[PDB]
Amino acid sequence: ALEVLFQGPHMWTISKEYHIDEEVGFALPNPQENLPDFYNDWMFIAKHLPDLIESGQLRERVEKLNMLSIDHLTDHKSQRLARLVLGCITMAYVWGKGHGDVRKVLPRNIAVPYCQLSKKLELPPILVYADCVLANWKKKDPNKPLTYENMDVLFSFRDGDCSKGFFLVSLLVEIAAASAIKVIPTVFKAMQMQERDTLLKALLEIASCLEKALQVFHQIHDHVNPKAFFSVLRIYLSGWKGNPQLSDGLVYEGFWEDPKEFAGGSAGQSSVFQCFDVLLGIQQTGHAAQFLQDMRRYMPPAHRNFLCSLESNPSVREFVLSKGDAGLREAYDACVKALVSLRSYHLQIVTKYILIPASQQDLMNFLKTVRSTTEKSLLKEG
Amino acid sequence: TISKEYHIDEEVGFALPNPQENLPDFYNDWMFIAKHLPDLIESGQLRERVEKLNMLSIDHLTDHKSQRLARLVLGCITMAYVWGKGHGDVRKVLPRNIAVPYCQLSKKLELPPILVYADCVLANWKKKDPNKPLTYENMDVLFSFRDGDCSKGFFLVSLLVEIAAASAIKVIPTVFKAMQMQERDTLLKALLEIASCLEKALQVFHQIHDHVNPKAFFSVLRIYLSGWKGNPQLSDGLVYEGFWEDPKEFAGGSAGQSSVFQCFDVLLGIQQTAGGGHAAQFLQDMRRYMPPAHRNFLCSLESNPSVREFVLSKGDAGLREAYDACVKALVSLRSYHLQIVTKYILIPASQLMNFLKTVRSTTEKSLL
Numbered sequence: 110a111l112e113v114l115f116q117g118p119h120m121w122t123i124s125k126e127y128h129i130d131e132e133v134g135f136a137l138p139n140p141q142e143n144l145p146d147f148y149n150d151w152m153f154i155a156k157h158l159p160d161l162i163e164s165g166q167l168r169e170r171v172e173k174l175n176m177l178s179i180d181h182l183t184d185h186k187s188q189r190l191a192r193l194v195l196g197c198i199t200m201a202y203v204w205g206k207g208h209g210d211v212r213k214v215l216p217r218n219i220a221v222p223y224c225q226l227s228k229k230l231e232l233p234p235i236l237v238y239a240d241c242v243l244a245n246w247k248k249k250d251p252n253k254p255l256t257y258e259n260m261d262v263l264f265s266f267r268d269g270d271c272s273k274g275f276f277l278v279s280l281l282v283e284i285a286a287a288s289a290i291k292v293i294p295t296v297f298k299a300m301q302m303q304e305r306d307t308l309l310k311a312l313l314e315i316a317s318c319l320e321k322a323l324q325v326f327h328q329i330h331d332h333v334n335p336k337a338f339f340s341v342l343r344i345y346l347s348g349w350k351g352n353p354q355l356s357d358g359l360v361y362e363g364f365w366e367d368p369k370e371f372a373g374g375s376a377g378q379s380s381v382f383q384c385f386d387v388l389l390g391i392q393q394t395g396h397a398a399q400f401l402q403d404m405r406r407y408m409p410p411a412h413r414n415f416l417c418s419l420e421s422n423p424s425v426r427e428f429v430l431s432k433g434d435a436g437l438r439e440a441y442d443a444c445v446k447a448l449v450s451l452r453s454y455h456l457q458i459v460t461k462y463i464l465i466p467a468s469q470q471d472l473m474n475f476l477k478t479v480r481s482t483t484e485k486s487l488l489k490e491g
Numbered sequence: 492t493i494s495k496e497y498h499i500d501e502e503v504g505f506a507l508p509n510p511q512e513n514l515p516d517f518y519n520d521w522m523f524i525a526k527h528l529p530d531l532i533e534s535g536q537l538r539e540r541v542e543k544l545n546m547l548s549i550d551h552l553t554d555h556k557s558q559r560l561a562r563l564v565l566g567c568i569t570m571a572y573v574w575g576k577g578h579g580d581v582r583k584v585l586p587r588n589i590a591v592p593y594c595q596l597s598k599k600l601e602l603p604p605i606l607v608y609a610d611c612v613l614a615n616w617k618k619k620d621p622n623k624p625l626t627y628e629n630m631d632v633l634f635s636f637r638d639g640d641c642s643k644g645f646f647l648v649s650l651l652v653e654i655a656a657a658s659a660i661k662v663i664p665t666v667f668k669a670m671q672m673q674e675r676d677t678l679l680k681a682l683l684e685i686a687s688c689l690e691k692a693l694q695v696f697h698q699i700h701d702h703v704n705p706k707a708f709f710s711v712l713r714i715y716l717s718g719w720k721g722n723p724q725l726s727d728g729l730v731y732e733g734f735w736e737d738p739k740e741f742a743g744g745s746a747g748q749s750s751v752f753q754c755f756d757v758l759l760g761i762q763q764t765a766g767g768g769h770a771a772q773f774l775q776d777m778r779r780y781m782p783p784a785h786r787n788f789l790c791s792l793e794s795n796p797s798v799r800e801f802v803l804s805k806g807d808a809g810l811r812e813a814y815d816a817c818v819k820a821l822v823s824l825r826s827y828h829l830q831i832v833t834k835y836i837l838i839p840a841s842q843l844m845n846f847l848k849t850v851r852s853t854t855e856k857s858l859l
């Protein structure tokens with residue numbers, strides 16, 4: 110960071126200041142399962158959101174809370190758990206049973222420490238992908254590997270909402286894509302040094318990682334069901350930006366005067382997918398371009414910094430295009446075709462889990478626009 | 492010192508140092524129109540002169556300084572074409588012979604195909620006498636839109652403020668190195684030096700009253716500075732004929748595109764681009780309208796540790812007082828700016844503010 114100010118933007122190494130783990134990548138490694146005893150009143154509500162919502166007792170338990178100070182959350186891992194705890198509670202409070210009865214005012218005893226801890230971590234006071242995906246997980250047995258069977262989420266909204274399935278499959282894909290992040294400094298160093306064979310090997314390794322990530326994504330069908338995702342999980346993931354149910358935003362009582370509008374949790378907030386579009390020169394950032402640029406403001410600041418540092422580095426696409434090297438172009442296209450495959454598989458999933466259940470009781474245009482931009486980035490056709 | 496890759500000058504800072512006054516003879520057809528925009532617009536001959544142009548290739552613009560002059564030339568012509576005499580008759584289609592090389596040269600420089608602060612302020616200037624100093628008397632702009640539009644006054648005062656603020660940019664590496672090295676006295680000296688520079692920049696800003704007038708700014712210059720993003724006059728954007736199929740929407744020139752003012756908010760931890768407000772979104776978007784090296788510098792400043800969090804964590808009154816000197820100087824600049832926008836915009840309209848008051852409020856709320 111100091112050396113980039115003096116010698117210029119050059120990603121010869123991935124700095125610890127970017128908060129990318131060698132193993133989990135953009136995910137929070139080994140998230141905290143428990144908070145200090147001082148916050149047991151928050152932890153009780155968050156760990157019992159399904160029963161509290163169903164019994165109609167949730168809003169009362171939130172309203173009858175004492176305002177706890179965020180000063181007892183010393184380290185980042187505990188501040189991130191608190192963010193996930195308060196975030197999950199806020200969604201449950203605002204949406205309730207999830208059938209029309211909204212709450213446009215968040216109680217001061219929860220809204221004050223929430224916006225305080227949110228300001229500390231530079232994140233909006235709404236549940237984000239970094240909370241319910243990147244920090245909402247644990248290993249059942251630490252010695253066993255990071256697989257679905259050896260993992261669990263920390264919080265759910267309703268019984269049978271498929272929260273574990275949806276969040277853990279997204280996380281397992283994040284970790285699969287993370288192995289290609291280690292290859293990024295190799296790409297920039299080989300471009301600077303003009304090591305063509307090294308760059309080719311690096312581009313093929315990134316493609317190999319994104320191909321393995323598509324295989325991981327097939328597990329969605331075994332852990333999520335269309336009725337539960339559309340009818341239940343979708344509601345608790347909804348935000349208050351451009352929403353007819355909370356047209357002016359949410360009142361963060363004791364923190365802001367007027368209601369504030371924030372976008373709901375979105376996989377458009379995933380730092381790993383945005384960093385491959387940046388790396389490969391896919392100019393993703395129209396409505397889709399604006400949405401993805403905005404979703405960076407919903408990512409952890411170290412990850413938001415990593416994305417802009419990747420944009421400050423030379424273009425891998427322009428470099429490949431300028432070399433008149435078929436093997437290098439074929440390797441670059443392997444990376445692009447792996448992203449097109451992921452986006453195309455994703456559209457198939459959104460048809461099964463959103464488009465079809467909706468017919469049996471937009472965002473399709475966003476995903477088709479993203480995929481179209483990825484496919485139009487190929488040099489030789491796919 | 493800050494890397495040469497950031498394109499910050501020791502003297503002018505974010506401004507383009509010694510901008511090129513003339514383009515190669517191959518582009519004399521562009522230069523004739525641009526240098527005669529006041530007469531060509533008034534006579535109604537400008538749109539015809541643009542439509543009767545041959546499509547020139549951008550390949551004869553070899554170095555950056557000439558590519559930036561071409562961007563200023565094509566940009567000024569584009570505003571004059573779209574807005575014409577500036578009284579309702581808009582042009583929703585930009586001719587292929589100008590729109591094609593404009594979007595081509597814009598793609599090269601990573602800038603949108605619309606006139607930006609980097610064109611009409613940072614690269615739209617010359618020294619009357621090179622040996623004399625960089626003062627109003629010894630300076631002039633390269634292009635104007637209409638006679639009596641106060642283009643020289645508005646653009647040169649903005650530029651003179653940019654250069655006044657530039658002297659505090661040299662102090663930035665000193666701040667970060669002293670935080671890393673834990674040199675408290677060095678950090679205090681550096682914070683006071685930055686405050687000194689932002690105090691001197693407020694003095695420079697007073698010249699606006701001597702070189703701009705409310706009637707000419709509101710009635711004339713404002714029109715040519717207007718863009719096509721959220722504009723009821725070009726609701727769908729502009730057609731860049733021979734480059735894009737559908738009309739594209741781009742924001743007009745804005746001092747929100749100044750890299751020097753954004754870098755002091757980043758340095759001092761004023762979260763201007765946070766909260767999800769209209770002001771936070773606008774300032775984040777305006778980074779896409781800055782030269783990429785300057786956009787990279789802003790990002791590099793964000794990647795560095797927080798000076799505000801560091802000062803807050805030390806329980807050091809002298810250090811907090813020095814940090815607050817920097818913040819109070821930015822509040823003073825923003826408050827003086829609001830006074831100017833009342834005289835030059837709010838009052839002439841009776842015969843924007845919410846954005847500037849939201850920015851200033853965020854700066855004041857940052858005091859310790």
Ligand code: HEM
Nearest residue numbers: 278279282283333375376377379382452458459462472479
């Ligand atoms: C139950 C299955 C899934 C459904 C119904 C689903 C739905 C959606 C929707 C509606 C969006 C649009 C953005 C928004 O409005 O929030 C989106 C975007 C996205 N999703 Fe999924 N998703 C599923 C599984 C996954 C998984 C497992 C991943 C892996 C991390 C993933 C990665 C992405 C990415 C990266 C985007 C951003 C746009 C893009 O870059 O393609 N999705 N998803």
Ligand code: HEM
Nearest residue numbers: 648649652653703744745746747749752825831832835850
């Ligand atoms: C004739 C006098 C001036 C008027 C009427 C004026 C007007 C405005 C307006 C309307 C905006 C809002 C952004 C937009 O809509 O584009 C703005 C922003 C701004 N102006 Fe001025 N301006 C004047 C002089 C100056 C000068 C001389 C400077 C010095 C560089 C300056 C610096 C700024 C900055 C930095 C912003 C961005 C917001 C902020 O950080 O405070 N202005 N100005």
Ligand SMILES: O[C@@H](c1cn(-c2ccccc2)nn1)c1c(C2CC2)sc2cncn12
Nearest residue numbers: 237238241242279343346374375376377463
């Ligand atoms: O973007 C989120 C989302 C939004 N909808 C959605 C469903 C129906 C109607 C409207 C919207 N579904 N999922 C999302 C994740 C949440 C945890 C952050 S994880 C992930 C992977 N793909 C999408 N998402």
Ligand SMILES: O[C@@H](c1cn(-c2ccccc2)nn1)c1c(C2CC2)sc2cncn12
Nearest residue numbers: 607608611612649713716744745746747836
């Ligand atoms: O922000 C720009 C602006 C916007 N308006 C404006 C006036 C009336 C109604 C709406 C908008 N005036 N100026 C601006 C500069 C443009 C040339 C790049 S230079 C500078 C210094 N202070 C502000 N600006």
